[PDB]
Amino acid sequence: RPNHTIYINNLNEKIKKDELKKSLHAIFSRFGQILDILVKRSLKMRGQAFVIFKEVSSATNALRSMQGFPFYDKPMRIQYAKTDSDIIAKM
RNA sequence: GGCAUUGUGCCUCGCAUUGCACUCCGCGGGGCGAUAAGUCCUGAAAAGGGAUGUC
């Protein structure tokens, strides 16, 4: 808060992992270089995603711009990740 | 290829689920080594790939 990583939820759980990942990437890539998307369809982690930006400017612009955007017929809910993703905590 | 066991992850249907991960598996049916994926394995890596037993 802020953070390199944004946590998206209220996502449409019927989307296949591999295309949700590439969809998040194609859309959020417009707000800066991206290092990873982490997506699981587990019961704990379905409906959600972590997209990890290289620079925090990117993240906060993505969080402000894309808040509530209609994505696969649901409005995205975007917060800052509560904590640093492991790949940005190694640097 | 068949069979047993099994690591690993994918798809789909019903019910359920708004859930802060990188220490990762909802329940119940159905379909999977596949040029997906993988948290499992091989390699010193970049890359690659189920495994052990048994006809």
Ligand SMILES: Nc1ncnc2c1ncn2[C@@H]1O[C@H](CN(CCO)CC[C@H]([NH3+])C(=O)[O-])[C@@H](O)[C@H]1O
């Ligand atoms: N990565 C793969 N790619 C293609 N197929 C796979 C793959 N992993 C597994 N299977 C399939 O699962 C079957 C074996 N079951 C047990 C029954 O024997 C394991 C189920 C699962 N591990 C579980 O614990 O719920 C194999 O024959 C494959 O068809």
Ligand SMILES: [Mg+2]
């Ligand atoms: Mg099932």
